[PDB]
Amino acid sequence: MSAEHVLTMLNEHEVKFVDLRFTDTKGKEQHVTIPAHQVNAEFFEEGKMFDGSSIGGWKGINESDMVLMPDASTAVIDPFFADSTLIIRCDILEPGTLQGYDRDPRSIAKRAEDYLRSTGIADTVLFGPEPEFFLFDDIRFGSSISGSHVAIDDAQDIRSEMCLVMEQMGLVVEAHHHEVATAGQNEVATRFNTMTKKADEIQIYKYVVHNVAHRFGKTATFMPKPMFGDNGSGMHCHMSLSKNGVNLFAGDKYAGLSEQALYYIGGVIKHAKAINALANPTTNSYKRLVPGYEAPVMLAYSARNRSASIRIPVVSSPKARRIEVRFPDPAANPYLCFAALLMAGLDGIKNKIHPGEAMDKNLYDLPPEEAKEIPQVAGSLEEALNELDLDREFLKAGGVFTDEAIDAYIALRREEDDRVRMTPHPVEFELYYSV
Amino acid sequence: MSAEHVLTMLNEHEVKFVDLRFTDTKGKEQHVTIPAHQVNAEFFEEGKMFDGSSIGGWKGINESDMVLMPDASTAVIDPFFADSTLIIRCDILEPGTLQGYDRDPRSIAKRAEDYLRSTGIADTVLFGPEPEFFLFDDIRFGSSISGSHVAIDDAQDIRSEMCLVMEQMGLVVEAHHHEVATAGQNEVATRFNTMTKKADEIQIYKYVVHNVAHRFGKTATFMPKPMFGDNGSGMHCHMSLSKNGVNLFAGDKYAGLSEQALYYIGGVIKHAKAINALANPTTNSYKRLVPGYEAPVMLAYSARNRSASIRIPVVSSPKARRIEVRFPDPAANPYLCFAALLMAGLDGIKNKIHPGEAMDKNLYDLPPEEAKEIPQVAGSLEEALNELDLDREFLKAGGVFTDEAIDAYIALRREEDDRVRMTPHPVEFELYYSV
Amino acid sequence: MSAEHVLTMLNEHEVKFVDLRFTDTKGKEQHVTIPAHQVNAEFFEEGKMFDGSSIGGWKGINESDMVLMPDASTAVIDPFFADSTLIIRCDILEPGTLQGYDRDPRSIAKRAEDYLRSTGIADTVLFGPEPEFFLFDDIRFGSSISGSHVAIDDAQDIRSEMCLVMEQMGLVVEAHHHEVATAGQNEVATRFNTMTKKADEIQIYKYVVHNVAHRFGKTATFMPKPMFGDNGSGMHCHMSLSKNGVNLFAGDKYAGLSEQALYYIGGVIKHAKAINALANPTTNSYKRLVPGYEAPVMLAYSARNRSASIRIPVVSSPKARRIEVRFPDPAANPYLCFAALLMAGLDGIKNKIHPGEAMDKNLYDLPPEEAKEIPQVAGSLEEALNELDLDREFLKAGGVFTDEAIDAYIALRREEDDRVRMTPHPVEFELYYSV
Amino acid sequence: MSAEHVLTMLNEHEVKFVDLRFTDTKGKEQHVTIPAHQVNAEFFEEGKMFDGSSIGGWKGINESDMVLMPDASTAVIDPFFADSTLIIRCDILEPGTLQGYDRDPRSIAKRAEDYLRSTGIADTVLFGPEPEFFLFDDIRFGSSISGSHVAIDDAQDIRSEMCLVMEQMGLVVEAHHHEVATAGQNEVATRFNTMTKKADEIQIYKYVVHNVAHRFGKTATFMPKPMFGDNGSGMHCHMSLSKNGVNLFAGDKYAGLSEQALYYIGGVIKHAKAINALANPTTNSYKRLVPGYEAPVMLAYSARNRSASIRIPVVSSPKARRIEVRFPDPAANPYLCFAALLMAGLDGIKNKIHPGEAMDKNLYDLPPEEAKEIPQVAGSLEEALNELDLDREFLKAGGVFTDEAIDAYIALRREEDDRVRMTPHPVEFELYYSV
Ligand code: NI
Ligand code: NI
Numbered sequence A, B, C, D: 001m002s003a004e005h006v007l008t009m010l011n012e013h014e015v016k017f018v019d020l021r022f023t024d025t026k027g028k029e030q031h032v033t034i035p036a037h038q039v040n041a042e043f044f045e046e047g048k049m050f051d052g053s054s055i056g057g058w059k060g061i062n063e064s065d066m067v068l069m070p071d072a073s074t075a076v077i078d079p080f081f082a083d084s085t086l087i088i089r090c091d092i093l094e095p096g097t098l099q100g101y102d103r104d105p106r107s108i109a110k111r112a113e114d115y116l117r118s119t120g121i122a123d124t125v126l127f128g129p130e131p132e133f134f135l136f137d138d139i140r141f142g143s144s145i146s147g148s149h150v151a152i153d154d155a156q157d158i159r160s161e162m163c164l165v166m167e168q169m170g171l172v173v174e175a176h177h178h179e180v181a182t183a184g185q186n187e188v189a190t191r192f193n194t195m196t197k198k199a200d201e202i203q204i205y206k207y208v209v210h211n212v213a214h215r216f217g218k219t220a221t222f223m224p225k226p227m228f229g230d231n232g233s234g235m236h237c238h239m240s241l242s243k244n245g246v247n248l249f250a251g252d253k254y255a256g257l258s259e260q261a262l263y264y265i266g267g268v269i270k271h272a273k274a275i276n277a278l279a280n281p282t283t284n285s286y287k288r289l290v291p292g293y294e295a296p297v298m299l300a301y302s303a304r305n306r307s308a309s310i311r312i313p314v315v316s317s318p319k320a321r322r323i324e325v326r327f328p329d330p331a332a333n334p335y336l337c338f339a340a341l342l343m344a345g346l347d348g349i350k351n352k353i354h355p356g357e358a359m360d361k362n363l364y365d366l367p368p369e370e371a372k373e374i375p376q377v378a379g380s381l382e383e384a385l386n387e388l389d390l391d392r393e394f395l396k397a398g399g400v401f402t403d404e405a406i407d408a409y410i411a412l413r414r415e416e417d418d419r420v421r422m423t424p425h426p427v428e429f430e431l432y433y434s435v
């Protein structure tokens, strides 16, 4: 899809505004709105000058402005704006060299895919994530200097009309798994795409979910553990690799899974805590990664066991042979999370890392001399951030991740880890006020 | 009715979503909604992969996913959904063998009917149940750690428009017995069908009742005893057996009832407590099965007496000669309840079990040496569950009920029996607080 | 599809009338309209008494009334009637024995399919015909005692809205081949079905075409040669045979065509003039079966040559391997034409009749010693009728065609052949008035 | 633009039909309409099987069916069809090799552009044509065996709404030159594109013009000389060549025109009669190519003279430096005409053919020894066809034009040349009836 069709869309729909959208390192979606008459054919080869004071690494204290370069293939009319608006996802570029910014998640995902095609291991990667959310009727939260409080108060029309709006915005939905045990938790299934296209689709997914919940007087949250004792929100990711139109993950070994797939799983397992720094970036994210029942915390693979973090779905077709990693949560930044998973898999393929043996029939039942032995995902955000700081190397292959970008990301996550670490919590008043 | 007509219905009505519905062992109705463009001709020969974490036996800790195979003959447009939806009832199948799941109520009902046709006793069975419900204006209930509470606050338009919606959804209604003594209690009469078709119709019946009551700002409940001292909600079941188009229950013996019918009643009477485990599955269900006036608790048959649990209606036609069992309540799972009743009757026919003699003129008036002698239905849910655990055999004939399915059902009922058993109740505060 | 769903359709659509439709031996579609309140559940097991004075064999001078037994699976709402009408196709049955009438085309097609399944050669037969029609702006014709005259005066909306109405009436359309050379001639392609279902679909096809052309102020005709020198209207028929879900026409011989398929072609070739009596039943039909260019008159098969009457389409799938016979015209009676083709093929399979050799590169170019040798289709309606009278045998196998039915059909065709034979024609005034 | 966006367009606009359009060798636009539900993702990688009995070379008497492969980037909603239709231009491919048909104009244009990029002379070619048409109020014509006749009877709303509909269909209009001298003649100016895109735009241009004229009760014709003595309809073509984003036609020689441009003009001049066979394909086309005033018949170039066929527009920008050839008429087939012009220019560039000297100040004033010397365009269709038959070579470079394709084109043009040659014309009755 080119720019000429975008101008044709502008004239066709009588678009008044164009909303240029990009993503922080935090994963939040930033936008600049320009009038539709400011969009010309030349606008797609210079972009728009932008002031980079966005939170995170973009708050670099030496530098000048950045460039918003739109991707014309991502244009879609916004369903929620009263004045007809055309949404375009943009990359952040350095104004001089006109190259992708080092601290841009979308540019990093594009670099990861380019490095994939460069190494010759595969031609493309297919990602299907399963982001789950919570729908609440109401919620009030706050934390002043004299205390804290939170209070959450828990239809088919909302779910169906979410699916309708998602299909308006170019997503191909194919199910909707409302859950009656742990009521409130929903998940819409969508079709697989490549890495950066699927990350853009996740951003659209969250936008639609939030706004449709708003219009029905509800509140949706992609927060990994919004509520005590009830099951948390996860985002399982199915990965496949394709070269010239055939799976590299289809083979003859365990559960019909190929040798390259086994090294992919080995690479994911080895770096899973550095990955956890990016796939599980919040402190809330580790209140659902606690050892127990149905918790994706054991770093091993099994088609049968459902305590293993890496699952191998059984499909009656060799053309659909993928691996599902289950520890990521929907609070991740899709670009950074997906790039981290891809680079871990590529480092596993490159170094012939063997995962080991399938943990078919060994759940959290605490085997006498195996519960401690099996690798686990990070236990807290500090541990994941420290392991990322130590294990930068697999992210730097091919120049996808800069040391400066990783440093800025880690500092930005730490300034929230510390705010959580130093406030006193009401459960500690319940337990330790008298003590 | 085939799949081609279902695709034609999709195109005709401009259906946007398809709602695939199945039933727990608890009897609750579960659903998965898929977009209408995901429904193709091939969809009716592979089904839809489903994650079986539903409550009950389906929470089996070894196993992988199940298959939702729709029954195209059960397709009906949903009247209550804003976005046009097509409801299809589905069976749960094991993905490999592609056979009916052992813990699936609908598959069990189908197996029971198949065993009926296999034994050669009859060709088909006709079930007509009479589920009664309560309409309330409002209700608030709850039970915290510091107490409990319940409060229930008690037109023709609602009843008539229920009947209209039921006839929209393929049900053939033929009466509506609002009751002025014990106000609030309603019942819609519908036409007889075979076992599994009638169970599907009961599920539609409950769905329509609940949602129509919702839209008028009321609350309907199929709970056997929602309110003290007032008469409880029952579900009387008329059974008939037909072979090549003639009743096997029509004859020349008592009240024009045939010998095969008498053995059917004998088999129902013998196993009536194992049946009670399935037809009366709640602890509330035994607050209406208390000995007294108009309580269907005496295990005997009579055309005249109305304290006998098994009634023989008098009909001026040999083509309508049935037996009515009156102890079941609308909280039963229609598939399991109907399969249990059919298998008890078939075991009575197979073993030539004679019921005995009609209790024509012997009510609850406590005869000097007969009140204790006459068999009674179970007195509590624990007694019924224990008798089911001991009397599995009649359910296992022909492989309809698996030991594993019965075990899972009993455990699932016990986890609620125990929750009821260990909470203190406000009437015990009224009676025993000072004591 | 059963009768209960038909009654549900009556109540759902608020149907006022039910139109029971059947087909003459001439192929014309007869109907009886009854009020919708005359349609009850019992109506589908006694039919409707009918006075059989219809033209053709049904005008039997001894006999009493016949029975219209509806096929509930053929119910469809009529798009053209102002008062909502439900169309149901009916069979004609003998009132006493309640068996299919011997002179009923639909009953004959059902008998042919039953004989197919009986012989064990195959399980089902798939027919796809390609009926072509002419759309004219106006036409006036007539023939009095003092002369004769005819005058024919030749958009996308009509074609598209024909396809829309055909898909309303249960047909699956998949193309529309308007033709610019020989303007006026159209053809809608539809999906393959079994014999009698496809014949019912051809009747619906003609009904829709005629009425949609009426509403746009046009005139459509399925007449094999309505206009001089311009190409005539044909109805090519693709046949396939399936047993347990696999083609019997897929193999390894010429053009990937199986041995059973070769005997099918041999049987069609041997009896092609007796077939022509039924597939080409009009005298007009032999003004397009004249030897020349693109005329399907040579009784031979070839994947490449297009002067052969039997074509073998090349398809990049073994699951679609069929034979196309091209001599039939849309004036045929679909039931009788299809039954004749099926029985010729079955007699070829039964007697191991070998077709011979493919005529790949031999068109009408008149080879020195082959133009006379190759078998041809009948040259006139009298020749075809005489060959049918002599070659009854292949039609009588399994009792599908009665001698009495064939005799009545031949007499009914002859009374029109003779009317054409004895009137003087204006071209004979042009040629012979002075002579 | 890809296929996925086309399916999204199908769902978005609620498209009912898809109209697949291709072009004869005569230039006429053929179409096949399929229902929108027949269009799936796989439809864009197999196409649609088509019966190639179209007039011209496609009427090849040996061959089987062809394949319609749609170009998803050419999808546009049809403004004139009542039932929402999506137009897609298709290529004709050989079913086996799945390569472009040799007798397909669009495939030939694609081959010409591919050969352009292959030779390395330039990277792309920009064509801007100026097709002129006549708007008439009414017209009646005919030619029977007893005579002939023609009668033509000659607003801003029509022109403006033509421009509106053209911009609906993706064309970028930028003027509308209604002409008051020679009333009736119109021309819409549009923006330059590459060869095959501009040819598709010419087909859309003609479609819009014809249908908009229809709806206002007018008749538009792109016929080079519809009316006596009044100026004829032409189609001037501006050519430019670009390599890596810069004109090769911009330089320092005559009128700021580069050396490569001069060889391009030389090549066009040398082969201009073989070109005339394709750019001026009708016999009417040579009633406007008669020597005289403002007739583009002198084969020479000049920025000032307007009797030269090749003009060099003066533009105040080196980025817009093109050559305009003025002899082509709108009855040409855009693909074949443009491919012929491009190949003549490429043969001129390849062979260093020098055009000669500019004919700045030498009009048709008949110089004493120059009127005969200067090369002229063909004087009749027979002369142009003969010169094409003799001068095939420049068209065959790179395999763009097959000998078989050229032969079929020439035969197809001759069968119309001969029909014109052998009928007697009313002006010959005016001149020679008494003589
Ligand atoms: Ni998952
Ligand atoms: Ni229906």
Ligand code: NI
Pocket (backbone or CB within 6 Å): B130, B236, B324
């Ligand atoms: Ni009752």
Ligand code: NI
Pocket (backbone or CB within 6 Å): C130, C236, C324
């Ligand atoms: Ni054909």
Ligand code: NI
Pocket (backbone or CB within 6 Å): A009, D009
């Ligand atoms: Ni678009």
Ligand code: NI
Pocket (backbone or CB within 6 Å): D130, D236, D324
């Ligand atoms: Ni010009």
